[PDB]
Amino acid sequence: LAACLCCAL
C-alpha cells in the first residue's frame, strides 16, 4: 500500500 501511494504520485 505505501508504495502504491508513492508511485501513484
Place this chain on the structure above:
Amino acid sequence: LAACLCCAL
C-alpha cells in the same frame, strides 16, 4: 495532490 498525500497517511 498535497492534501491527498497527507490525508492518505
